[PDB]
Write a protein that binds this DNA or RNA. Structure first.
Length: 33
RNA sequence: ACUCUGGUUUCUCUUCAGAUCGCAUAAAUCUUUCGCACUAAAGAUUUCCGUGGAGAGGAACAACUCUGAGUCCAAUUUUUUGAGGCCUUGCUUUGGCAAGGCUA
């Protein structure tokens, strides 16, 4: 629903914001590995 | 001994950090090693708990402590005198200079 979609968008934003802590280095190591 | 900065606290955001970033210490994955892997070691990666530095924004009271900067000597030894006057020579830039001999 509208509220549900807004909620999951917010929660996905929260999760990617948290993963932003080491996003660059983690993604670089994963690409290299 | 006179004047001008810088404050401190709190909330949020951005970046860097192999520094005991943390006077503490988890978990997962992959590889290797031997056992035969909670009762086991090594290497690497990741995620978590949560930090310091710098920068930026917000808002609460202290504003010159501190960090800075701009702002009493006459008696030997130094700055309260042994100073000035005469004579010769080389050259006179004819003002006298240089050296020596003097008198005080």
């Amino acid at each position: 629903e509208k509220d549900d979609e807004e909620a999951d968008a917010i929660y996905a934003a929260l999760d990617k914001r948290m993963d932003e802590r080491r996003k660059e280095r983690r993604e670089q190591r994963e690409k290299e590995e």
